Every structure is written in structure tokens, then in C-alpha cells.
Scaffold this active site. Structure first.
Site, mmCIF file in Angstrom:
data_model
loop_
_atom_site.group_PDB
_atom_site.id
_atom_site.type_symbol
_atom_site.label_atom_id
_atom_site.label_comp_id
_atom_site.label_asym_id
_atom_site.label_seq_id
_atom_site.Cartn_x
_atom_site.Cartn_y
_atom_site.Cartn_z
ATOM 1 N N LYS A 246 19.465 -17.349 38.697
ATOM 2 C CA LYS A 246 19.948 -18.414 39.385
ATOM 3 C C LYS A 246 18.316 -19.048 40.087
ATOM 4 C CE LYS A 246 24.288 -16.040 39.956
ATOM 5 N NZ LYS A 246 25.405 -15.661 40.763
ATOM 6 N N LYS B 141 22.557 -12.849 49.394
ATOM 7 C CA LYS B 141 23.661 -11.654 48.292
ATOM 8 C C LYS B 141 24.035 -10.589 49.179
ATOM 9 C CE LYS B 141 19.056 -10.403 47.203
ATOM 10 N NZ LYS B 141 19.221 -9.915 45.283
ATOM 11 N N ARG B 142 24.690 -10.204 49.053
ATOM 12 C CA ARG B 142 26.463 -8.403 49.970
ATOM 13 C C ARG B 142 24.467 -8.550 51.095
ATOM 14 N NH1 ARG B 142 31.151 -7.984 49.029
ATOM 15 N NH2 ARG B 142 30.978 -6.148 50.307
ATOM 16 N N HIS C 122 26.923 -0.751 36.054
ATOM 17 C CA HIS C 122 26.483 -1.309 36.493
ATOM 18 C C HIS C 122 25.746 -1.374 37.730
ATOM 19 C CE1 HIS C 122 28.983 -4.662 34.461
ATOM 20 N NE2 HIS C 122 29.724 -4.250 35.157
ATOM 21 N N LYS D 97 19.311 -3.696 49.652
ATOM 22 C CA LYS D 97 18.316 -5.082 49.410
ATOM 23 C C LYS D 97 17.670 -5.756 50.184
ATOM 24 C CE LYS D 97 23.328 -6.130 46.721
ATOM 25 N NZ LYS D 97 23.057 -6.413 45.884
ATOM 26 N N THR E 157 21.580 -10.742 39.482
ATOM 27 C CA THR E 157 21.834 -11.893 38.493
ATOM 28 C C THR E 157 21.176 -13.055 39.644
ATOM 29 O OG1 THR E 157 23.765 -12.134 39.676
ATOM 30 C CG2 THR E 157 23.544 -11.036 36.975
HETATM 31 O O1 LIG Z 1 26.453 -6.149 36.509
HETATM 32 C C1 LIG Z 1 25.865 -7.307 37.460
HETATM 33 C C2 LIG Z 1 25.843 -6.933 39.307
HETATM 34 O O2 LIG Z 1 26.909 -5.730 38.772
HETATM 35 C C3 LIG Z 1 26.041 -5.319 41.044
HETATM 36 C C4 LIG Z 1 27.499 -4.407 40.996
HETATM 37 C C5 LIG Z 1 27.713 -2.960 40.317
HETATM 38 C C6 LIG Z 1 29.040 -2.451 40.732
HETATM 39 O O3 LIG Z 1 28.982 -0.215 41.082
HETATM 40 C C7 LIG Z 1 29.624 -2.884 41.532
HETATM 41 C C8 LIG Z 1 30.117 -3.816 42.028
HETATM 42 CL CL1 LIG Z 1 30.986 -4.669 43.428
HETATM 43 C C9 LIG Z 1 29.065 -4.895 41.324
HETATM 44 O O4 LIG Z 1 28.923 -6.118 41.784
HETATM 45 C C10 LIG Z 1 25.298 -3.994 40.621
HETATM 46 O O5 LIG Z 1 25.029 -3.992 41.800
HETATM 47 C C11 LIG Z 1 23.916 -5.282 40.232
HETATM 48 O O6 LIG Z 1 22.651 -4.593 40.147
HETATM 49 C C12 LIG Z 1 24.044 -5.965 38.751
HETATM 50 O O7 LIG Z 1 23.507 -7.590 38.572
#
Ligand SMILES: OC[C@H]1O[C@@H](c2cc(O)cc(Cl)c2O)[C@H](O)[C@@H](O)[C@@H]1O
Ligand SMILES: OC[C@H]1O[C@@H](c2cc(O)c(Cl)cc2O)[C@H](O)[C@@H](O)[C@@H]1O
Ligand SMILES: OC[C@H]1O[C@@H](c2cc(O)c(Cl)cc2O)[C@H](O)[C@@H](O)[C@@H]1O
Ligand SMILES: OC[C@H]1O[C@@H](c2cc(O)cc(Cl)c2O)[C@H](O)[C@@H](O)[C@@H]1O
EC number: 2.4.1.1
Lengths: 813, 813
Positions: free
Chosen positions: A657, A545-546, A354, A551, A653
Site C-alpha cells: 500500500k 499495523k496491529r 498465513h 512487528k 500487505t
Molecule cells: O496474508 C495476509 C496477512 O495475514 C497475516 C495474518 C496471519 C494470521 O495467521 C492471522 C491473521 Cl488474523 C493475519 O492477519 C500475516 O501475519 C501477514 O504476514 C499477511 O500479510
């Protein structure tokens, strides 16, 4: 009231009312004179839950009799949000319960607002797991979500003096009506100890034992009568734990030590913190889940058929210990030979990456694994030796490749690279968007791709159109269903049929009306719950977003200040009014992220109280951003900010949305943005900035922020304002660290995208001046958002990784 | 099957069956194929609970409308045991549920054995509170039991190698269907801080806050449709508690510190341990309860009527802080003057003393109260000053009386005498048996009795005939009801009518038959659950109670060894066969008590395996003695051992349980034994040993154990056996501490009662040889046990202390 919310039949409404009153009396032990609004929520929750149980029992009976291949989705995070409305939607009960409660003199929406979010995740990865569960149930897959039942989820965020304050998310305080404790399925988990070798192989002895108690939550499919299970483990001390009065009392009190394992979610998103408690959590979920899996498999000796009946999906590296734990169980306990055990493991496990951010990669110190999991370290070393032997045979003499691919990293402290472990022990490895998966094959996992090209896949992320359209935006779902029917809710590709309505004046008016209604309602929310006044006619410019440097909330901040400075320069010139909303949580230890929140509020303080600006520009920080808030703000948005530095956001994601809910996107060609723009057409997207290749070129040359400062007078003014104390008069040097990072230590090239960003934002304001053409572009976005349904994503995992065929067929009610 | 267990009507049984199946399906989420026996228990528990709720709501509605004087019974212990059968008994549902479950293919007794005891007490004092709640509901009093919801109750006792091992009583593991959480009534409790003085009196500031969350349990009256409430407080941390990641994670984990307050019951019976955690528990219950009381009183300004609407009963000194806490609230928060506040407090509070043992008296170090409760210490000092001013005026010049009566004890560490505090601030002080109350006026509280004679009362203890006859001994309850009807169950004095059946041959045969049935069933239990073989034709000689030196399990041990030695001397001589059963828990830190358990098992090991003894003598230690075990063994007993040194057992209640269930009593003239013997007639009781006056005479002279050793050859042989290693061949000196204490440091004069005890035991064996006359004496005991119903005790508290009239009238169903 509205069609998509189901039928409110006479027999149904009458039955719901009597069952509501039954629960209020027998379950809550109240009457209408003493009942609180929370009692009314619980009465409804219990009433709706009753409709799930029959389907839940018959789904699990179905799986026992048919014995399909089971999918196990392992994750440390499930960001579920609220469950009540979602359950009504999937069961077609929404209008019936709405009518039933109305006749009882109650407002259902008010009751819905009482439910706590199940906040068992940080952001994108946790929410993805939640969307996936919904899609797996909707597609009739025999799927189980396995995780930890944290007593405290993601912290509630309070803003005090412009600063983030954290408070405990005590989400179980009032009880959770959705879960069912299953103490009969309690399993032991081992920690510490040592390894003894005998004639009959290795033995792991002198261990400390923690019990894992499961809690089951139903996951309903969309109107197919399927109800799957999310099983979350809670840590419990054994009754002889640590077992004088001082001694006795203390021994009982020390039970807390063992139970701390499931106490709290680590609140870091996209960041690795190598803490022992986190490692314990990772093993705890893995050890209990695998025992449960094997138990279920035996209750169908011959482990050759294991991969035909079991698929294990690893959500990032967090459950990576599943690989050596499966080996441990098969070799040490089941007495299979290494090679056969390894074949089974590889065919069973698949790994989803991810992130590419180095600070997010899990690299556990060998000394930690040595003390906590001595047998697993031995297995990891043996895995490594055998893997590197294959590398050496494939690329003879390439000694540096051996060191690069090793699961063991040498240095000051030896570490285990958990990503390397996952690739070695999985038959499939996927990224979460096309550009992300390509970056994996080209950069960080290049060596592994060269060794085993077949292993590497893409599965572009998606979101569930149930929660993220029907639930949060019923007005939009309805105007769509009026034209094309209801089938799109479980087949989102059908939204393409909306392209034949882009010149339909009735539809254009309806799309714009739905947005305006959403904006008005959200503007009221802000007054009622936060005493803030906004102009509902302004463009709703939102970045939620966080909080992370990658970001680039900071880039957004620079644009906001630019607009303010341009207004102060030419006050009597017309500008398109904007409400700029920024929200998100910062990880408690992430100092720079906390400084960015303070900056945002500091800008608002100056901007919102300048009489010359009036209501032409407002800056609001959205407190406590979470799933329930996302469901409110996302339907109200006009402009979606997706502005990460190219190559850093694996997918995103939140972007999907906003697209589904009628906002236009300003974004970099990063993560899923690339595929979104491709689907809608680049002319219907506000793309700006460096591409990944441009970032690479800049790094080769050397990024010098001073260059941009010297050549852009508008940018220079902002930096001088920040430095001199314009946004912090009492504390002139408050933002010194931010200026310093921007000028000298900016990993994410904020200045480099500033010019293009501002110019692109001008093009947005111009289009917003023409409501009809804005809305027509909106329609072209909504109409092409079908690819980003998690039903599509899950169907791809099923066919290309798990080897199972999805089904849209109903089970009998 | 049997009459007293109620009607099993067609409509009732059908309704119970359908509601059982509803709960199994909707509540437990199971079907008949997957359900465990525990699921079946819970389905039944939920079904029975449903019948309580209507009555529970209408009882509390009744109290709101009628506004009677409320009784608040404050206790740190409520030893409730199991709830299912008790609830069925009081609601007349037992036969109906028995039939309903039979038709479902289930054995109800088997299901009843699945329920965990609510073990929130140590022994006599905790069980008294439980009996009292039952009687208060049966007598229609507006009464509330207030306590702590301990997460872990009294430890489960395991015997390993003859030694007591403790394990955590995790009684909430599977959930508690009887309780209802009431988070809406959560209240804050303050600790630590400091006192500030202003123009408007004192203020308690800078405190740490712990939340008190109430859990309500229904208390049904006997077939009167009254359901009262037991409210137990659970400790919860506030959400900003202690609120970097290390910092964040640790702050959440530190919430455990605050919540440890309600974690565990202190497992000491009749013993004071001056630990801070215990003090916190005592204040926690008091602070939350008093806020709840005052809230309810205001929801009826004028505190003159407070004592007309509120009575607070202090169960021992444990809730003694209620006195200064009521003063604190009235003076500091309500702004009443001292004198008026004190008048209200005194008229509101009453105090029950349960012991004269010096080691059991609560004397808290001033330095503890100074740090934890600084304002309460100030109030206590002021109470003391004003009280001693009254003493000085009543007895001028008597300086030693002033020092004796002071609430503050001077010495190495200054302490607060909590008993002195309770007498000063209460309008009534009672002992728990006639001899005990006289001892209070003659010895430890003599000075206080001289100052305020009117304050001092007696309230002889009792037990509930619902749990302790109808529930545990249905066969005996039935044969009684056949003769005299059912009215005695709530009017136990009616048992006197049984005296006209003492020569009735049919009744004599039935009484003996019921006992034999109970003995046979209990003998089967021991085989099934503990693999031990006993002769059901032997005399069942039982001593069950907490292990304490004052209760003299050691004296029992000496008799057992005497019998064994007499058998070994004349093997072919006939002796009445006995099964000697001794059971009870030792406080974990009480070394001597733990040694006594080991001695008992050591004697059994020798006695039970001697071929010459055969089945003429057996010694069994009853493991894990608790309420549920008491309900089994007590109906099976022939001989009840109540052999404490005269003047040490304040009352005893186990004694009354045995009397009601057809056992004869061997006992000293101690506690309630005196009144039992008086009621039955001394000829129908096996009385032996020193009276209180004889103990006093011996102490004045000086107790010399060697004298008895020198003059009693049988006693000398036993001591020599113990010393030489006869009962511990591998560890010859194992029992050296016991011999030493007996010979040199015996506070309880074991040797002094040995001769009379053994001779009295001979008279028991002689009577047992004549079954008809044994049973006739049994009938004369049962027939005169009416005084010892807790209905009588509670009626006396109501009329003579609380100023309320009990009612036997039904509330509408
Ligand atoms: O796959 C779901 C999301 O994971 C996110 C994501 C990656 C990661 O290594 C750890 C956490 Cl907690 C996270 O939310 C990605 O940054 C994002 O690009 C992606 O859309
Ligand atoms: O998103 C969850 C729910 O949010 C509701 C909702 C949306 C808002 O913007 C505000 Cl301010 C309050 C609110 O309750 C929607 O009305 C409802 O349609 C939707 O299902
Ligand atoms: O005391 C609780 C219950 O104990 C039951 C009971 C008594 C025993 O002596 C044994 Cl060994 C097992 C048992 O279940 C009684 O049969 C029943 O009548 C009573 O209500
Ligand atoms: O009043 C109930 C019982 O309390 C007992 C008792 C007294 C005490 O100070 C503390 C505890 Cl935990 C207790 O159970 C008495 O010893 C006994 O005589 C009496 O029958």
C-alpha cells in the site's frame, strides 16, 4: 473535476438528482428541512445501490446459464471498510454523483465520512480477503465470499491517559444499506449430540440446532458490469428453542445463547485462543456454506464432477472443518464410499497458510471436539490413520516422522493440529510470499513437503489498486493517467512505463506536489478531529499495523528516543524534521502490546512538550487505526516502516500500500519486502538488519541482549532512561516489564537490529534533504509496484490452483 | 368488484403496476422467475407504503405549524394485527391494488395471508389500544401511541395431543416494512443507583443506563389524509456497556442483559405477575416517552401551559410510573416547587381502569422499587403523605379509611397499590362500560369516589368499524351501502336507518346470503388449513377470547355435553345442528386454563367420532386465536357466547365485533352486554343468568355447588362422566382438578347459571329453525350497534377528558 473519476453527463446528473430526492422522500421519510447529514448519506447510498441491482441480477443469471466452475472463498474475516466510494469507483459514477450532490447543495466527501467501516476483520488476513473479492469480480470469476455476519466487528479504540480502551463496534446501529437478507435460504446447523452406528452407516443424533440466515452483499468488478456476492451467515434460534411463566419468559430469553455464535469477532490477530465460542463460529460458517454449495451444485447425484464445478479456498486453518464436514456429508448422507469421497474432497479443497508463529497455530483440544462435534472427531481419527499408513509406506521404520506428521498431538491434553489436517485433505497448499513459502518447505511443513512436493506452492500477496490508489489517492492516479492512460488500473504492470519519466522535470514536480497536498490535508485532519499540531514540511515517518512484539514497534520507539537524545545533546545542530506516526490496535488480552501503546504515548508526552526540540521531532499515536484511516494516512506518508524480525511477517500487505502511494520503505528482508526490493532494485529501498539466516545463527549461539547493552552507549542510555522513570516520573517503575523482556526474554531480537536500523535511518534523512532525488527514487518505486496488484495474485490462484481462466471482458450493461 | 372498496381508475392501476415492478426489482432484488409469493407481498406492501409517506410528512408538518394540544396514549400493549389491508381501506386503494395485482397475474388475498400479525398484545386491552389509534386518526386528533417494540409478541399456540404448546412469535424474522427506525431520537433511561441530597435538592446517581431507540409506524385515518404516529421503543445497550479476552468477549455478550427489556411480551391477560423484568419494561416505556413529550413541548420554560398542550392517557396501571416520573423531572431537573409540579401532573394525567379482579391489580413490592427506582419510591411516599393529609382533613378521625386509601399497603411484604397512585395523580378516572364504572364507585374505589366524585367517569368501549366491518366483512358492508350509502363507515349511528328495512324481503334475503357466504368460506378454510370437516348449514356457535375461569368456557363445555347426552338418549329425535367453536390462548403458567383447553379437545374427540351424533353436533377448538383469525371467524358466526359471571368482564369488545357482523348474542348482564341489550332491545338479545345483585346475594349466603349437583340430574350425569373417565378412558382421573374446583372452589359460580343457560340455549335453537325471523332479529342488532364504534368512545374522551374537539375535515392530499 478529475479525469479518472468518470464522466458527469447531463442526463446522468439529472437522473441521479431525482433519484436522490425520491429516496430522501419515500425511503428515508424526510424533507430538506428535517433531514440530517446522515439522511443525506443514506439517500446517496440508496441511489448508488440502485445502479448495482440490474448488474447483480444479470451476473447471477449469467452464471446459472453458463454454469462455470464456482470459486468459494471461505474466511472468518472480511475487512471491507466503507462501500460507497468503492462502488462509485467501480461503476464510473464518482464525478456524476459529485456533480449531482454539489447541485443539491451538498459536499459528497462529508457524506462519505458518515459511513461506518464494515470492520469484520483484524488486519492483514481480513483485508486480504476483501482485496481478493474485488480482484475476483474484476477478473470475471464466478466467485463467492463466505463468512460470518458479526453483529460487532473489531472494537473501536479509544486512548485514555495513554492507555487503550475498547468499545463495542456497533456498526449495524443505523442499518446497512448494502446487505440483502435472504431468510428463504436459511439452513440448519447441528451441534453436540452423539453418534449411532447402524446397518446403513453412522448417524449423528440428539443434536442442538442453530439456524444460519444468509445476508448478501454485492461485490462490483471494475467497470466490467460484473457483480459477485459475499454471503455472510447470521445465527438464529429455532422457534421451538427451549420450548410456567418463569419457564416461558426464560425460554424466550435463552434464545440469545444460540444467537451469540454470530455476535462478536474475536479481536486477536496472529494468535490462537482455544475458546469454545470460536470453535462454534468456525463450524457454523463451514456447515452452512457447504450445504449452500452442494444445493447450488445439485441445481445445475454424480459427485465425480464436483471438483470440476467447485473449488473451496480455505483462508488459514479457520475453516479447516470443511474437510471432515465434506467427508461427513458425502459418506453419511450421500452414501459414497470413503475412498471416492476422499478423492473428491482433496480435489475440491486448497489451503493457504498465513503464519509460522507457533502461538498462531490452531490446535484444538480433543475433549472440545468430542463434546461439540463427535462425528467430526471420528472422521479426523480415520483421516489420520489412513494418512499415517501412507507415511509409513513411504518412509518405512521412521517412527519419529509418524509422530511429527500425526494430525493428533499427544501430551497433557491431546490436540488436533488443524494445519496438518488441511495439508492432508487439500490438493494445494500455498504461502503468501516467496520467502514464507520457502520457510514452510524448509521448516514447519518439511515432512509434508518430502511426502508430497507437488502440493506446495507460492502465491505472493497483493492489494487492489482500486481502493489503494484510485479511491484513496485520486491526485496521484490522475497525474499517472495523464502520462500513460487509464488502462493501468486493471493492469498494474503498465506502471513500468513510468520509468521513462524519472528524468522528466514536469512529472517529478507533479509527484512531489501530490504528496505535499496529501500531507497538508492529513495535517488538517489531525487538527480538526484530534486537536494536534504538526509540521507538514517534516518527513512523515509512519508505522501502521496491529501492535505485536514481532512487528517491533519497540525498535521504532528506540530510534525515536535516540533522535530525541541526540537533539538534547546538540540542540543547535540541524536535523531533518520528522513527524513519527505510530498506530494500531492491541488484542485486549495482550498485556505487552498494551504496554507498548502506553510507551509510545509516554514518549510523545515528553518529546512533544520539550521546548528545545521545537517542531523538529513529533511523536503521535494514531488512534483507532482501521481501513478508513489507512486510506487517509497512507497517501500522506513519506517513509514506510516494515521492520519485523526476519522470518516472522509471512508477507505483509501494508508494505505494498505504501509503495503504491509514493512512500519509500525502510525494512528488513522479511515477507514481501524481499520481492518489493527485488522489483524496485535494492538501491531504491532502505534495507537493514539480520536476514533469516543471521537470526538462525544467533539462535544456535544463544541470543544475549546484555552484549548489545554493554557495547552500545546510546542503547544503554535509553534502557537507563526507561528503567529510572524518565518517561514516567510519577510511576518510575511503569515500564519495568518492557525493560525486563528486552533484557532477558526477547524472542524478536530488538537489540540485535538496533545499530543497523539507526544507521539506515540516517541514510533516509540524508536523501530527504535532496527533494529531487528523493522523488526520483519514489518514482522508481511506484513504477515497479505492479507485481503487488491482487489481480496478479488472483490470476495465479485461478490458473495454478482453481483451474479456471480469468476474463477481462465486459458483461452487457 | 364491490363499491365500498373504492375506484380502480386507469391511471391509478397503471401507476400501481409500475411501482410494484420497481420495488420487486430495486427493493427486493428479484425478477418474476425467482420471486417467491413472499417477495410479491413485500413488493405490494412497499407500493402501498409509498402512498402513506406524503400524507405522513404533511400531517406532522401540520401539527408543528398549528401546534394543537397533543394526546399521548401510553400502553404496554398494541394488538395491531395485519397492516396491509387496513392501509388500503383507509386510503381507498383496495380495488385499484386488486385490479393491478390481477393484471400482474397475482391474487391479492393470497398475498395478504403472508403478512404476520403484529401481535404486541394479549387480547382486549391491547386490541382496544389499536382500535383507539384508528379512531383518533379518523377524528383528526394530534395523537401518538407510545409503547414497547417487543421482539417477540404473544406466543403462537400449537395444539399437541389436545394440549397447548407455546412457540416464539418471531414476527420480525422477515422484516417489518411498516416501521421506520429513528436512531436520531434515541434517549437514555436510568435504572438502580442511589439518591444524594444537596443544597439544590435531590440527585439520582450511580445509575445503569439503557438506551431507548424509537421505531415509528404510520396510523392512517379513514380517507381524511391524516396519518398519525405510533412510536415504539426498543432497548439498546450503550457502547461502553461493561467496558483480558475472556473479559472483552463476555462484556460484549453481556449487552443482551440490557436489551432483554424489549425482548418479550408478558403473555398474561388480566393477571398480575410481580416480576422485575416487567417492572423494568413499565419504567422503560414511561421514562423514554416522557422525555420525548417534554422535548416536543419545549420545541414549540413555562410549565404552566403544559396541561394545555399535553394530555397523557394511562392504559390501565401499567404506565402508572408516569406520575412519579413527571414529578421527578419537574422537581429534580426543572426545579419547580412540589405544589406547582403536582398541579401540572394531575391536570396532565388521566387513568383508565380495565378490571376489578383482585389478581389483576398491580401491587409492587417496596423492596423492588427501592432497588430499581430509589428516587421514585421517595416521591411515591411523599405523594402518599400529602394525599392522606387531605383524607384526614376531609374525614377527621376515620383511621380505617386512611389505611384503606393509602398507596402503601402494610403486611408481610409492603406493597405499592398502583391503582391508588393513579387515582391520586390523575384529574380523571374512567371505567370501560356503564356497569363497570358503577361497580368502581360502589366497591373498590368507593373511598376515592367519596373524596373526589368529580374525578370519576364512564367511557364505554368500542371497536373500529373499518377493521371490524369494511375490512373483514366487505359483503355485508356492501349490501348496507347499497341501501344507505357509505357515510356510516365514519358515522356508525347511521346504521339505525336499517330499521326501515327489517320487513324488506330483498334486504332480509341479502343479509342471510352474506352470512351463508361467510360460513361457506370459513368452512373451506378449516378443511384447507386444518383438515377438519364441518356442516355449513349448522348453527355456528362460537366463543373466542382468552381462556379464563371468569369467562366460563367451562359453562359452555357443560352445555355441549348436555346436548351430546340428550342426543344419545333420544337419537332419532330432531335437533337443530350446531358447530360449536371455542378458541383462545391460555397464559403459559395458568394451569386450570390449560386443563380447560384439554377438556374442550377431549369432548371433541368423543363427540366428533360418535356415529350416532352424525353431523348434528361438532366441537372444534380454534387453534392460535389472534386478530387475523378473528377477522375470519367473526363474520362467519351465528351465535356469540358472552357468558362471564356478572361483575367480572369490565366491558368486553369481542361482543361488539359479533354484533356488528350479524351474529345474535347469548349473554349475561355483564360489561358492555348490558348496553348492547339496551340498544337492541332485550327481546332481540338472549339474556340469561344471575345479575350482579344475585351474585352478591349468593356470596352473602355462601355458594354451595353441591346443592346444584343434588337437584339437577343432567348436571350430575356430566360430573359423573368427567369423574369416571368417560372423556379420558386411558387416564380416568385426568379431569379430577376441574371436577374438584367446580364442586368445592368455584369463584365464578358455573353451576349457578347452568339451568338458565341451557333453557336460554333452547330458545336460540327454536329461533334458528325460522330463518326469516332469525335474520330479522339479526337486522335489529346490526342496526343498533352504532353506539359501539370507537369513534364515539374517542369523541367522548376528547370532549370530556382531554379537552379537545374532534374534526372530520380532510387535510389536503
Ligand atoms: O496474508 C495476509 C496477512 O495475514 C497475516 C495474518 C496471519 C494470521 O495467521 C492471522 C491473521 Cl488474523 C493475519 O492477519 C500475516 O501475519 C501477514 O504476514 C499477511 O500479510
Ligand atoms: O481515502 C478516501 C478518501 O480520503 C479523503 C481524505 C483524505 C485525507 O487525508 C483526509 Cl485528512 C480527509 C479525507 O476526507 C481524500 O480526499 C479522498 O480523495 C479519498 O478518496
Ligand atoms: O378479514 C380479512 C379478510 O378475510 C378474508 C377471508 C375470510 C375467511 O373466512 C377465510 Cl376462511 C379466508 C379469508 O381469506 C375475506 O375474504 C376478506 O373479505 C377479508 O377482508
Ligand atoms: O378495555 C378492554 C378490555 O380490557 C380487558 C383487560 C383488562 C386487564 O386488566 C388486562 C388486560 Cl390484558 C385486558 O385485556 C378487560 O378484561 C375487558 O373487560 C375489556 O373489554
Amino acid at each position: 473535476q478529475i479525469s479518472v473519476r468518470g464522466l458527469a453527463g447531463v442526463e446522468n446528473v439529472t437522473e441521479l438528482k431525482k433519484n436522490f430526492n425520491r429516496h430522501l422522500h419515500f425511503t428515508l421519510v424526510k424533507d430538506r428541512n428535517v433531514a440530517t447529514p446522515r439522511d443525506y448519506y443514506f439517500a446517496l447510498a440508496h441511489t448508488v445501490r440502485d445502479h448495482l441491482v440490474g448488474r447483480w441480477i444479470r451476473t447471477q443469471q449469467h452464471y446459472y446459464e453458463k454454469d462455470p466452475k464456482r470459486i468459494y472463498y471461505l474466511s472468518l474475516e472480511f475487512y471491507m471498510g466503507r462501500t460507497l466510494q468503492n462502488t462509485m469507483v467501480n461503476l464510473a459514477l464518482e464525478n456524476a454523483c459529485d456533480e449531482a450532490t454539489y447541485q443539491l447543495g451538498l459536499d459528497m466527501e462529508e457524506l462519505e465520512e458518515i459511513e461506518e467501516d464494515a470492520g469484520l476483520g483484524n488486519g492483514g488476513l481480513g483485508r486480504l480477503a476483501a482485496c481478493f473479492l474485488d480482484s475476483m469480480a474484476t477478473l470475471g470469476l464466478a466467485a463467492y465470499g463466505y463468512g460470518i455476519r458479526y453483529e460487532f466487528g473489531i472494537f473501536n479504540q479509544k486512548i485514555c491517559g495513554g492507555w487503550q480502551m475498547e468499545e463495542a463496534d456497533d456498526w449495524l446501529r443505523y442499518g446497512n444499506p448494502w446487505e440483502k437478507a435472504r431468510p428463504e435460504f436459511t439452513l440448519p446447523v447441528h451441534f453436540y449430540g452423539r453418534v449411532e452406528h447402524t446397518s446403513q452407516g453412522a448417524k449423528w443424533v440428539d443434536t442442538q440446532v442453530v439456524l444460519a440466515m444468509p445476508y448478501d452483499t454485492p461485490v462490483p468488478g471494475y467497470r466490467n458490469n460484473v457483480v459477485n456476492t459475499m454471503r455472510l451467515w447470521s445465527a438464529k434460534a429455532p422457534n421451538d428453542f427451549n420450548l410456567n411463566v418463569g419457564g416461558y419468559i426464560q425460554a424466550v430469553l435463552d434464545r440469545n445463547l444460540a444467537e451469540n455464535i454470530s455476535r462478536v469477532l474475536y479481536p486477536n490477530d496472529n494468535f490462537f485462543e482455544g475458546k469454545e465460542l470460536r470453535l462454534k463460529q468456525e463450524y457454523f460458517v463451514v456447515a452452512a456454506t457447504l450445504q449452500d454449495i452442494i444445493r447450488r451444485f445439485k441445481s445445475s447425484t454424480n459427485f465425480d464432477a464436483f471438483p470440476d464445478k467447485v473449488a473451496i479456498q480455505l483462508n488459514d486453518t479457520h475453516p479447516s472443518l470443511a474437510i471432515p464436514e465434506l467427508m461427513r456429508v458425502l459418506v453419511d448422507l450421500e452414501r459414497l464410499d470413503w475412498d471416492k469421497a476422499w478423492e473428491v474432497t482433496v480435489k475440491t479443497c486448497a489451503y493457504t497458510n498465513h503464519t509460522v508463529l507457533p502461538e498462531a497455530l490452531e490446535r484444538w483440544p480433543v475433549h472440545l471436539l468430542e463434546t461439540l462435534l463427535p462425528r467430526h472427531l471420528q472422521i479426523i481419527y480415520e483421516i489420520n490413520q489412513r494418512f499415517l499408513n501412507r507415511v509409513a509406506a513411504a518412509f518405512p521404520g521412521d517412527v519419529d516422522r509418524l509422530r511429527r506428521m500425526s494430525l493428533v498431538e499427544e501430551g497433557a491434553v491431546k490436540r488436533i493440529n488443524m494445519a496438518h489436517l488441511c495439508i492432508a485433505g487439500s490438493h494445494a497448499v500455498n504461502g503468501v510470499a516467496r520467502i514464507h513459502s520457502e520457510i514452510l518447505k524448509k521448516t514447519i511443513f518439511k515432512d509434508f513437503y518430502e511426502l508430497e512436493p507437488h502440493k506446495f506452492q507460492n502465491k505472493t500477496n497483493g492489494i487492489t489498486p482500486r481502493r489503494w490508489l484510485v479511491l484513496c489517492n485520486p491526485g496521484l492516479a490522475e497525474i499517472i493517467a495523464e502520462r500513460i492512460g487509464e488502462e493501468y488500473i486493471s493492469d498494474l504492470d503498465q506502471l513500468r512505463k513510468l520509468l521513462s519519466y524519472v528524468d522528466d522535470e514536469a512529472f517529478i514536480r507533479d509527484v512531489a506536489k501530490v504528496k505535499q497536498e496529501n500531507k497538508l490535508k492529513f495535517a488538517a485532519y489531525l487538527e480538526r478531529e484530534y486537536k494536534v499540531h504538526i509540521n507538514p514540511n517534516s518527513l512523515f515517518d509512519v508505522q501502521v499495523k496491529r501492535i505485536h512484539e514481532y512487528k517491533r514497534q519497540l525498535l521504532n520507539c528506540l530510534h525515536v528516543i535516540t533522535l530525541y537524545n541526540r537533539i538534547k545533546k546538540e540542540p543547535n545542530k540541524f536535523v531533518v524534521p520528522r513527524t513519527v506516526m505510530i498506530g494500531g490496535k492491541a488484542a485486549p488480552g495482550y498485556h505487552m502490546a498494551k504496554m507498548i501503546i502506553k510507551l509510545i504515548t509516554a514518549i510523545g508526552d515528553v518529546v512533544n512538550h520539550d521546548p528545545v526540540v521545537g517542531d523538529r521531532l513529533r511523536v503521535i499515536f494514531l488512534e483507532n487505526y482501521r481501513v478508513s484511516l489507512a486510506e487517509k494516512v497512507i497517501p500522506a506518508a513519506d517513509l514506510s516502516e516494515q521492520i519485523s524480525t526476519a522470518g516472522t511477517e509471512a508477507s505483509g500487505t501494508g508494505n505494498m500500500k505504501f509503495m503504491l502511494n509514493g512512500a519509500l520503505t525502510i525494512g528488513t528482508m522479511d515477507g514481501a519486502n524481499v520481492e518489493m526490493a527485488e522489483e524496485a532494485g535494492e538501491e531504491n529501498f532502505f534495507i537493514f538488519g539480520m536476514r533469516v539466516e543471521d537470526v538462525d545463527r544467533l539462535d544456535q549461539r544463544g541470543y544475549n541482549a546484555q552484549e548489545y547493552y554493554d557495547r552500545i552507549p546510546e542503547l544503554r542510555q535509553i534502557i537507563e532512561q526507561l528503567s529510572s522513570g524518565f518517561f514516567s516520573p510519577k510511576q518510575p517503575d511503569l515500564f519495568k516489564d518492557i525493560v525486563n523482556m528486552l533484557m532477558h526474554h526477547d524472542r524478536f531480537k530488538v537489540f540485535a537490529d538496533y545499530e543497523e536500523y539507526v544507521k539506515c535511518q540516517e541514510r533516509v534523512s540524508a536523501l530527504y534533504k535532496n527533494p529531487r532525488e528523493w522523488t526520483r527514487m519514489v518514482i522508481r518505486n511506484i513504477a515497479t509496484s505492479g507485481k503487488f496488484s491482487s489481480d496478479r495474485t488472483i490470476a495465479q490462484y485461478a490458473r495454478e490452483i482453481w483451474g479456471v481462466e480469468p476474463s477481462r471482458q465486459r458483461l452487457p450493461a
